[PDB]
From Swiss-Prot, chain A:
Location in the cell: Plastid, Chloroplast membrane
Function: Required for plastid development during embryogenesis. Might be involved in chaperone functions or play a structural role in the thylakoid FtsH complex.
Span within the parent record: 399 to 876 of 876
Organism: Arabidopsis thaliana (Mouse-ear cress)
Predominant localisation class: plastid
GO cellular component: chloroplast; chloroplast envelope; chloroplast membrane; Ycf2/FtsHi complex
Domain of life, per lineage: Eukaryota
This protein's record includes keyword Protease: yes
Protein name in the entry: Probable inactive ATP-dependent zinc metalloprotease FTSHI 2, chloroplastic
From Swiss-Prot, chain B:
Subcellular localization: Plastid, Chloroplast thylakoid membrane
Species the sequence originates in: Arabidopsis thaliana (Mouse-ear cress)
Protein name: Probable inactive ATP-dependent zinc metalloprotease FTSHI 4, chloroplastic
Gene inactivation effect: Embryo defective. Impaired plastid biogenesis and thylakoid differentiation in embryo. Defects in the photosystem II protein complex formation.
Domain of life of the source: Eukaryota
Protein family membership: Belongs to the AAA ATPase family.
Subunit structure: Homooligomer. Interacts with FtsHi2.
Function: Functions in chloroplast biogenesis and chloroplast division. Required for plastid development during embryogenesis. Might be involved in chaperone functions or play a structural role in the thylakoid FtsH complex.
Annotated tissue distribution: Ubiquitous but preferentially expressed in young leaves.
Length: 478, 50
């Protein structure tokens, strides 16, 4: 009933494995070299749990480990256990584990345990009691009484916090492996394996495709493979190249590119908006590497956009400087800066209303995120005066970013006009020509020193001061 | 035993391939934070948590 046939998926069929694959073959070792495991006196860990983002193919990993183990594979949806009737789900789990024990050696797979592994006492209904009964039955058949030493359960969940800590107890689910999102090499190999079934070329570089589509799951890479088949018959070329992959990634991350009727002043407004964003971004460290610049409207965004790929390590861990946010707020305010400096103060538009609120929200998050210097951080107080003063610093921070944006955009009028003209004539711009225009008409951008130079100057000042103290002690004493 | 204890208290939570080029600006910040903690702990001696 719950037994599947034709499980031929192996570890070669799945990419983006990494060191987790080692644990996977450890499971295979648990199914092959277990004689010396129990000879040394090791009870085989029954509970292995894969946790990660959806679409990474956890069930594909289950098929791979089942095929490499060479045992019977059971793949049961957890949604069938919950039902309006009680007792039948417990009997379903009983029959499942009984036929797993009879088919020993075997591995059993249950996906999305969050449906039935919810902590008891969170919902008041008969479905909650049925879920409790099924959880109790699976708990007993896992660890309750003796009789299982050969059947091993593999599970795939998304949210590990929802699970009952009774299930997380060792001997029931003790091995917890996280499947992360694929990095750079992982996306490369997933694209390779999903593209092995189609005729590819020898000049096909996956490095640019992987760097273009950053922070995406393996299902999204399979989708990129799926949009590598449908769109070349419009022109009718010979063999697939990397340009089609780049355009497919561009279509997927934003939407399909649609063209509508448009006047000249509307194009000019979108162009000066995008010029404001890119020109204020290039002079800042965290948003310096602008790679794309287009004003073409897309799905959901009638505006253009500026593409930057900053370092994605400090952002996740939280090591972004205070100046790194005062720069971003200036970037969000700079569309309004260009609008005010070009159309005057009395003719402000409403196209920058989406960035002008991001700037104020970022300032508000900064002032009560402990990053300020009013007393020392201190995002909370007691009396109403300091609570009122909490929101004063955000508005002064917006004001100083606002004047900074005015100064930055006023320094760069010639390159502003040039990039606006190019954006109107070509409707798109890449990194090379935009940076060439920047070098042709740019102003001076004196870079503030990084932390290394500050540490070096502080260290040399400290050494010279301490040796000054040493001589003022020595020659006064000697 | 040390690795079993390290796994069993759940120190790791990312669960990814631990191969990341850490910038000098981060090693410096961590070293300075740890050194400041060491200096304050040695100057203000805690009678129970050295």
């Amino acid at each position: 009933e719950y037994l599947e046939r034709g499980v031929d998926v192996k570890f070669t069929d799945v990419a983006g494995l990494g060191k987790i694959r080692l644990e996977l073959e450890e499971i295979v070792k648990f199914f092959t070299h277990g004689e010396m495991y129990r000879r040394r006196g090791v009870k085989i860990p029954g509970g292995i749990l894969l946790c990660g983002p959806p679409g990474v193919g956890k069930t594909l990993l289950a098929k791979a480990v089942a095929g490499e183990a060479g045992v019977n594979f059971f793949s049961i949806s957890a949604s069938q256990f919950v039902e309006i009737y009680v007792g039948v789900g417990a009997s379903r789990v009983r029959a499942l584990y009984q036929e797993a024990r009879e088919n020993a050696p075997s591995v059993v797979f249950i996906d999305e345990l969050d449906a039935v592994g919810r902590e008891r006492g969170l919902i008041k209904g008969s479905g909650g009691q049925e879920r409790d009964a099924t959880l109790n039955q699976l708990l007993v058949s896992l660890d309750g009484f003796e009789g299982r030493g050969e059947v091993i359960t593999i599970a795939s969940t998304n949210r590990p916090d929802i699970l009952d800590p009774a299930l997380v107890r060792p001997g029931r689910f003790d091995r917890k492996i996280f499947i992360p999102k694929p990095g750079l090499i992982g996306r490369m190999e997933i694209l390779q394996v999903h593209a092995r079934k189609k005729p590819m070329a020898e000049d096909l570089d996956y490095m640019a495709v992987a760097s273009m589509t950053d922070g995406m799951v393996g299902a999204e890479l399979a989708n990129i493979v799926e949009i590598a088949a449908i769109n070349m018959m419009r022109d009718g070329r010979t063999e697939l190249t990397t340009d089609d992959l780049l355009q497919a990634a561009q279509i997927e991350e934003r939407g399909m590119l649609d063209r509508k009727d448009r006047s000249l002043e509307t194009w000019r407004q979108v162009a000066i908006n995008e010029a404001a964003m890119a020109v204020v971004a290039v002079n800042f460290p965290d948003m310096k590497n602008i790679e794309f610049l287009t004003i073409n409207p897309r799905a959901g965004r009638e505006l253009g956009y500026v593409r930057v790929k900053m370092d994605h390590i400090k952002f996740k861990e939280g090591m972004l400087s205070r100046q790194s946010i005062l720069d971003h707020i200036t970037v969000q305010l700079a569309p309004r800066a260009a609008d005010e400096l070009w159309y005057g103060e009395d003719q402000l538009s409403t196209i920058w209303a989406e960035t002008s609120d991001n700037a104020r929200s970022a300032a508000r998050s900064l002032v009560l995120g402990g990053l300020s210097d009013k007393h020392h951080g201190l995002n909370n107080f007691w009396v109403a005066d300091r609570i009122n003063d909490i929101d004063v610093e955000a508005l002064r921070i917006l004001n100083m970013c606002y004047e900074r944006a005015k100064e930055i955009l006023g320094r760069n009028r010639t390159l502003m006009d040039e990039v606006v003209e190019k954006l109107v004539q070509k409707k798109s711009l890449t990194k090379q020509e935009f940076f060439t225009l920047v070098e042709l008409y740019g102003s001076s951008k004196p870079m503030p020193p990084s932390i290394l130079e500050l540490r070096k100057i502080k260290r040399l000042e400290l050494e010279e001061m301490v040796l000054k103290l040493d001589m003022t002690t020595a020659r006064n004493s000697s | 035993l040390l690795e079993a204890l390290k796994r069993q208290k759940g120190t790791f939570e990312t669960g990814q391939e631990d191969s990341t080029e850490v910038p000098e600006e981060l090693k410096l910040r961590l070293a300075y934070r740890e050194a400041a903690v060491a200096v304050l702990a040695c100057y203000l001696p805690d009678q129970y948590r050295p």
